[model samples]
Target: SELLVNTKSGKVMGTRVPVLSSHISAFLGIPFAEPPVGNMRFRRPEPKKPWSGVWNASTYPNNCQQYVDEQFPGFSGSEMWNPNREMSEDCLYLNIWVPSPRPKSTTVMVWIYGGGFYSGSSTLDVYNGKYLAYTEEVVLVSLSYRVGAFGFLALHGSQEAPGNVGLLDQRMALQWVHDNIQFFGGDPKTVTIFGESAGGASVGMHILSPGSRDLFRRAILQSGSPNCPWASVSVAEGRRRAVELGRNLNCNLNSDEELIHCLREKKPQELIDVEWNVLPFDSIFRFSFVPVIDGEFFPTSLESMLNSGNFKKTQILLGVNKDEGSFFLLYGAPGFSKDSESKISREDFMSGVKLSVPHANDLGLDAVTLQYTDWMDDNNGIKNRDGLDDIVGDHNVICPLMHFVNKYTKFGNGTYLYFFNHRASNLVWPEWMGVIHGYEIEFVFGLPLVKELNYTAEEEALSRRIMHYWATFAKTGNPNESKWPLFTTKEQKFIDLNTEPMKVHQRLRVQMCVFWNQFLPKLLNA
Candidate 1:
């Protein structure tokens, strides 16, 4: 039945549904910010204005502008984020699922989706909060923010179009939730922020952000870190893209304000219609529109931020998938080969290594390749062509992730690490792909049955355990009495999933990270 809840913005009508043993009230499409249209476009999102009549928050609002009915031809299950619906610039709404009718606050978990910062929506069926809310007994939330040119476009000398407005949108949502979640049976003080891929990196960025300290109490980062190459861009690159976009769009050539005003007049479709080449060197990165070093949100370099502990002093649970690198492997490179099942020769391995790590030669690719090959490739493989996925994982995702995990554990409080090796029984990728990126998201959300998932008993069991563990961590700092431990420099204690005999942090490509964090640093200095 529809029930009424009065908020700072006025009255909203939400509904409740049955789950497992209890019922959860769902409040969908609640506006958290004024629609970023006309004068508000490209500016930091403003607070939502009050409404007169009770707003029917029963259905999700339109998603922020991006591809709606698109798919990656060769890829299966990408429709999870594709979102078969309409999009618009007026899309700053959020959705919530409250597990209980109690007046007391429940631990809240806010989700930010990831699609390399170009595409993602909160309305995706996979992100539905019923399962998590019912299983975990916590309030679950998902939000939509601007993407593509509307979100990341930056103006060099001006703050008008300063980049990272997407991030600002996320922070604004957090603020709104913090102030209003209490009215929906959620804890305002103990909110936990989480995300995956670019979303995970976004969580890490919030950790580094000066504006995010009082917003959330903890974080769970899945397969991403701010240290990843594609997470943040140099300011100069942002300004160049701005100039290039204006010229190509036939906007005013004289002044920044005029060009920005002209761009604002163009339809959202016109802006995205500009050949993606409006920003170059994207194929290698796939992050043409992404977070950048804005003076306020970003403020400083990631290195300086982490080295000085500029992040919020909250606990974080972070980890990478077993085959995080296989995502790039399964598909062809941008503007190049599109098939990934082919055998990667030594040249192929080294080429990817160079692109991922700019100074592979300077840091000695042979030594690096040989180190990973010994551990990843057995039989003392000829040409060391094997372990291409291992190399890419180490160079791009896993190693960089471990570097941050190791440092945060050493300096941060009650941090935990994890290794996700569980490949779903319904294997979406080639068997050789092995526990690839995002495989754990299903388990964490406890999506035991979705027909297409066809989960094995073991997978279903893991999903239950993950749901319990995540919720447990949210209520109490640690996951369990003894199973999950505080991650540390000495113990490096962590939980490993999806194996005959469960392993610990060491199985998470520790050796590869040594080459990335320790060996590379000394070599760079020498």
Candidate 2:
């Protein structure tokens, strides 16, 4: 049967198709905001104007303009970052998948893709929401927003080029869903925002910001958080980076407005190319453009907000995979990827510590090396590759997450945690990258169940459980129905999500987290 939805802005057509056990009404490329093209470049996104005719919302939309490195070595899941569709400035569109035998109002699971806030496309095959929507009987959503310089170029306090417009684009999309979801058999009040990596950081920021806090009921962060050191920058730093880009492009305009105006005229690809040039080395560790601590979006420092327990009230499901650092190691340490059994010499290990940890002195570097040293292993200094990976993961992702989880549980309610530990049987990556970053996304979207990928029987079963647990949390704000324990500071328990009967674990890397969060700070400052 044909399906159509009458949103507040316009009427749209959808197509019906069988996914798994149920039929789905899928709508694609519905615009929520006006195109940030030409003169509207670098500004806040405006709501989409009402349409005069029925929009055919069948095809996926353009991905936001980004500079994907064609020359860079491919990761295990390179498609996650590679754009399969046309890239353009007019990319503020969203996709929705509603089950066929829809309820009057059902829970909604909204997704945000993670590409370090620079590269992301909602149209990836791995992110296809059909099976997840049908099996879970919930509405699934994913949206595209401005990325790279088009998304996050700040000019101090100028409104013409506000910082974190990428985030504003997300907020606008969430508002659109909250307003129009009822037309598609979705409950506006029961929306859950979730994402992996940078998308996870985006979800965490939404939880922290009053501007986007009330837009969703719950959030699930996968392998990323607002507390991650590389996720954001100070407003001053953001402004400096913007000016640096202008300098690189030879735009020696004096005023911020003039500089923005000059940038607005350049081809979109030029800005992205210049940014890639400006941060050639630093880009490996962090993106040149990330969310900035602008006063409006982020009124205070993230530490101040978390420390004072001032975050918006919402249930949170957050966790890291067992090998969160392995994916990044492929890019940061090329030798690790070149040879499967590569070893990190003492000099290389020290250099890795200096590069990974920001603002670390000689004393602090030595302390970190000593702290991560494997005393039991033969030739420990020569074969310290695993230790380096641990340091990178702990310093960049895991330790910072511990800070957020600890504070969130201290002042909030309804927190559930999981540690993804399963590597798919058909993965082409080396065995050393056991259950690395972003490996769990295929299971979360039910790709294993809907598509034939030669997955093990146990792998398919695990995907089903994860999808159920996720959608169940969206419906009731609790995933404990799947036998996972609620996270608390005292117990610090997390679910070890694998093919085996989900085991309950406690205090993941507790000592390492302490070294980074507590002991390392004192050592560095001293």
Candidate 3:
């Protein structure tokens, strides 16, 4: 199979791959930007030069430099790592899966993979675009971006070297797609950006980002939000981290040019392999690198921007899983002992709340934590491990997401929210571990390519329904025609996607939203 794809240079043949003796149009390893290596390090992404001939789009590009596979184990009972795959600084590439016999105009879904800004590639099995493109009748595109220090370091005296290079790379990829997707059977005007975890946060940042306003029409945020715990670090802290990296690399921080040159010259793997001696659990909470509020790309606080109606026109489908924090509780931070549990007195919990959110006054802290504790007790029952996970998760992920939703709804934008409660039948651990992070991705794609989790027949059906809803929204800026209710400040209706079919839970998790709105300013700024 052959398809015409016109780039800035000229048109070229985007070859197809054979599956079951039938060819399917596909493009892989397409460079969206010049390699961010050597002199390009810490600088803004530069658009790639046009190629003279047909470019191969069958194989995935290299993943960004990250910790060794042994260092960060895959989520329980999965393949550890493939040694054959290369990890390098030259990792800014994208892949696309288009239907062979193209549609006249198709909705394009651009996927940004999630690894907490440290690891993950667009080429991951969980993010394969074939099923989504072929079945949903929409064009699917996935791309890689820089991660860790390479993507998000804030060097001293280098004010021009804006942070969130990964995000900037994502923007560039969107620009590439907008400029060239028409030749490949996609409508550039109907692109929707979607991702999970950090990818979801990237979508949020894009929504808040002034530079990204006209790039995409719609977005899908899964299990992540703008007000995530990691999104609140101060500029001073980010600069301090960059200074520390400079010190570790034995480079001069005072001289911007010298520091940039030296850091760029350093081997990518060497930088990634540098041991910080921090435990795996410590890394999650105190991530060494992430998107910085450089006052440029991510100009204002996401909360403030939403409150000010910055994202009034961008339609969104956003939600978190029912058991979002269970994975973190069991795997990331397993040290919360029963003694620690019993010791979580009302005063202690309040103190914890105050410590985590230093901006809250004593009265505010008391009210917030108490309300959260009560909500947990009422929803999932009290004192059990699952209940504790729900409480902590809400305080961390869910509540913050709700805060964004409520603030955005003030502008009367087209927004739909949902809570994923269907647990995977092929349980990785025990059944106690409910719908964990990354579980929803398999359901959305309708495939069990992930080694740890497999989708049931019911799950597959749900995936098809979700794919339809997502693709429809991407194409038309609306997820529902007449069936689902639009989320409004008054109704606050949210869909609960489960095995029994989608159900409307009006004002669902209202307590969590109220508590977070009451506590966010305190937690975020502090």
Candidate 4:
């Protein structure tokens, strides 16, 4: 299998596969760190001790323990997105794909999965690195990190459970790639870290974190930012949630040590089974067990960190889908669900606004309602399906990302933005849904390169172009060799990527972003 590679942990044997008239070597399920089980629970990942025997990395790995209720309405459409194998605490493994008969020291692209911080795995079918590596002639790596409480529980003044262990797990994986990717014909000097949603937030966190400095040379964020309202909780709030989790588990809450001890004694499955979301709507970015600004991992507030201009200067590429909110709407927005065929009624639209923006007072709430309400529609709010989508999309993703780009561009260098507007022709969702979040992943990973899918000629070409852009960015820190224009404060233009001819566009949703980023904050504070 020249496919045998030596990592710091052990010798790994990968499988060879033929794709698009080229062969690639794929090494799956290589452990980069010691399993965080038993005594190691609630602590940062420890480097995997070297193994004496060769590690068989041919098969996929187990996903970290997460609550997966298949009967949920949204489950059927996204069934393929779930973990393919069983779950376990010992799930900190990474997969690598390299070009067979590879050139010397090629560029590397590392992927981080996004499920809003509580869910995701590197082994998902869409994340497979075979086509990307082969087509781009680069080394691709995707790693599994802990999620939910098992990864984010924080303890005040206690070294045992400093929060953001999930981030630490990712950092550990980066360390492994930095140290060992050379053997796999990867240039550690040019490594780029990219992720979607929470994974995107993680990339943003790594940018701000001193612990993550020098680990990556470039970063790509897809639909997530550290400054996003739901990406992180305050340190005190995180500690409180940890205690709440302990209380739910009947553990002694008098002290952090005792609570951690009690938690360590419980099964991994039991730890993940606890309900974390307290908000009424499940689709919004209201996850409870998320990253915390623990002063150490985060060092300080996300805004203050960005404002201070002290984060890593890695070149950044980030963007959001046009209809990013459609994915979130599938679960708990008005009359929308995975199974429901009917449209959201006007009554449901009125109620949905309150559910999404309950914190606003009468004045502020009226402003929001007036802003999102469609004046052009006489079909009540039924035709204004974009109302909830606009609100949720702007708050949860679009605006936060825009603000991040705005703030980061003030200090950071080589920043680029993409506006993904293309939805696959064969998607199961209604045409009205438009392009939802995470749809660009298939194109980015060059999924169309495979012969199995009956992708259109345009789809294949777009995937190739996207892959080329990503790989070019990873290699020389400039995507498209500076052909794709740089996104700066003065020039807020982004490449409008879609099935049609891509064009450079300025100010996506200018009116909405101003409302959400500027006027809405003033209203809320008033």
Candidate 5:
């Protein structure tokens, strides 16, 4: 059977071979760039040359080199590990699903998978786009970019490499969509970039990258925020970390060029194994391999770029789950030292508030902590909850996110903020973890091709609704046309996706928002 596809230039190629027999037309393992391996490692992505013959699109490309299954503590016994797929540097590929032979007016939704800026594959079972494409009648796309040291290591000679090859890879993939998606029944002009965790952060970077302008019209950031403690570390700090890693690997950093050559020449797996020791976790200070404030591509911080009125044109739908940190706890908490666990008290929680939001009054911190603590207690049935983990998580995650929502609403552009209050029945341990990180993916994409987690009937219904909300927003700027009101600085309307839908009369506590806004300039500069 014949199917529509796109060439390297994105021009409409005639009907080609069909890759699947489902309701949706599927294309997998399509290269968007030349493989970033060997000499190309740590450099900006280069374009892929066109092929004269039809290329196979039946399987997924290998994932980037990363820590092995043993490195992911909580997911050890889980279904994430696929013995079939191998890890390599040649992983810049993308997949697409179009519901029909030719969709003239369909919206395109591009998904970026999250793996802590380290290890995530576009071909993960949870990210399969068949349900979203077939049920929502829109084209869905997912792609793999570099991750971990292979994708983000910043060295003394990074000026030549200009770190963030992963981000560069993503930009190239989107450019490919711009040039080629029309042949796959997608409207390149109406593309919406969406992702969870690291993927969400990538979308935030796109909002700020000059190279990404006009590539996407809308964005969805779920369970991640660009303004976080680990989001923007100084180049000096990144270099220091690199030096530390070199020490761990017995490589001398004084010879910066030699260090880069050494890392490049080492086996991908060997480098990954050595670099895993330096990763920041719950016990240690948080570290991240994020898009940097590069003078050329990402000229400004996400906040400054958004607040400077440059980003007022694009519509946005951003939200986080009720228990985003729980996933981290499950994965990284076991590794926390006694000192780390001992520090999880209410007092410490308020101290964190004072540190993160310095302008807040003592009473404001108390109120905020109590409000969040009580929410956790009521939801999870924890007694005498003096632990500050929940409070710290909320303050660091949702509080700043709300601050951004308030700032964007002030611009009067279309924006919608939400709090995902739904809890999953399979608590994933520690009981009542409630909508942890990556929880929303299964709901948003519906169950993937491989059935890893079983969903209750109610959960399945919620998943369908989530997909509807997402697809509706992709099709048009507005998320809810019927019941949901357009967000504005004045009204501060926000949807509470918890139990029954409710609106926060005041979407944010103004005192807290002001406190954070004032605190950011000082913290970021410091």
Candidate 6:
């Protein structure tokens, strides 16, 4: 551990870990905000009171209460992603890891987790930052923000709640980093915010957020954006979900000004156990709980910001995996909840596709079919075995990302795309589940080796390259000290972070991207 580090909260002691190849100090579980308990529930985070003595930050904090066993059924453990914790509401803490003997200031990378705006935390082992910090010589920080209903439930209870307490918590955490990361040897001016899935979307949201204009200088969005389906919910929908939560808890009184107060008094598990809706592709971006356009944090939709060409002038490194949409769908087993084959059928696929188009009046599902399908009945186009994968990946993940890339660079700012295709043997993924969402995180963070899955020599090289590229970009706006081209409207270029001797690969989204861009705005408006 370092001698000591002074922070806004107080002095803290960090622990030492030398096994990661470099001597590093980790400040674990430092609270960036006051505990959101009692009257503070659902409200914007308030700063924590300064402590008197040396605060011990060696142990991880409790994860924000989330519904894993109750919601997912049969799945009950924190080892996978939630990490070791007894769930609780007092979880708005951040952790920092700095390589020992650092310069006065080094690049800082702040990570926001992704659980579709629900189940996730910074304590997850897969996010272990020692490898990245050690290899790149950058300070790494991971944070736990409110999740589930406790985080996103917009009850209209108080203006402070505003239905986006979760987002505010993140912004406050970023602000805390800005105000205090210097004490931990991080350069506040050179901070690059990045994360996977919902975390990636949060990174994008911060970029588009007016309140976050001065918080960070660079961003790396991975497989998510503010425009991505499942990123945000409508205000009307947010209200409905909140009301449902109140009803779930049997809370009485009409829009009780005490509504949030009553909620604050309830058991953390009671509120977290509220039923959540994970909408299917047909439901589009209709999630039960996520960030909404609250007029403060999110002043406008990302599409409008992109079309109007008004957003933070921050350099970005963004991209998706090869099969981003493959892991989204849920499956039914042949019996007893087990499956050997893909659950999606052709009829099911078509119905789902038709259901997915919101406005049948505006060139509807038939047009969608024409756009997604080819003229030949020889089982080409949307009729292949991988038809479901192609449709959802293109519509849900690929199109919006490409659209952002195209418009974002139209006025000239740096943007780099990546298609992550290499699957390490360490991952116990289904043979059919090639390069899915969250696949690149292990490579980026360089997760410590896991049992049952061993890392190959090639994987280590790839992980090193990924960390170098990310750290380089965090230090400077450009990802390439060696001239990797910027993505532009003319040539849709991205680095294929796969195979040996990485090279530039262009046209990430082909005519399929065109087909979606031409018509999907109708869906958004609908």
Clashes of each: 0, 0, 2, 0, 2, 0
Cα lDDT of candidate 4 equals 0.83
lDDT of 6 by residue, 99-177 (tens): 8785478899999888877778798777887888888888899988887777887755356467778888888889989
Candidate 6, superposed: residue stretches over 4 Å from native? 1-3, 69-79, 256-258, 277-286, 331-339, 354-363, 371-385, 448-453, 523-526
Cα displacement (Å) at residue 42, model 4: 1.7
lDDT of 2 by residue, 129-176 (tens): 998889888999998878888999988688889799999999999999
Q: In model 5, state the lDDT of residue 270.
A: 73
TM-score of each model, in listed order:
0.90, 0.96, 0.86, 0.95, 0.83, 0.90
lDDT of 4 by residue, 1-526 (tens): 3787877777999888777787788898999889998878888889899998788888989999886756454644476567778888999999989988965799989999998877888888889898999888899999899988888887857778888999999999999999999999999998999899998989999999999988999999999998888899887888888888887789898888899999889898777677463323434557778888888887788888988887997689989988887766666666876555436676777666665665666787688878887677724544556777778788789998999988898888788899988878667676656788888899999987776776777888889888888888888888875257888888688988876767888876778889878998888895
Model 4 weakest 10-residue run by lDDT? 275-284
Question: Which of candidates 3 and 6 reaches a greater TM-score?
Answer: 6
Two-way lDDT contest, 1 vs 6, winner: 1
Indicate the TM-score of model 5.
Answer: 0.83
The per-model lDDT (C-alpha) reads 0.75, 0.84, 0.70, 0.83, 0.66, 0.74
Candidate 4 lDDT at 401 equals 94
lDDT of 4 at 322: 82
Can you write out model 5's per-residue Cα lDDT over 1-526, one digit (the tens) per residue?
Answer: 3353547644222322222235556777788899889877777889897776667676767877775555445552244633226777888988887776568768999998777676788887667788888878888899788887777776634644566778888888999888777777788889999987778877867776777867888899886666655455555556666666666677757776767777777777776667656644323115445455555666766667668755536888888776665544434433223223223344444444354333345665555555455554433323212233454355556666676666656653588777777766654444435455566677788762223466576776777777888889888988764366666777777676643445564554455445445643444453
Leading candidate by TM-score: 2
Find the number of clashing residue pairs for candidate 6: 0
State candidate 6's TM-score. 0.90
Q: TM-score for model 3?
A: 0.86
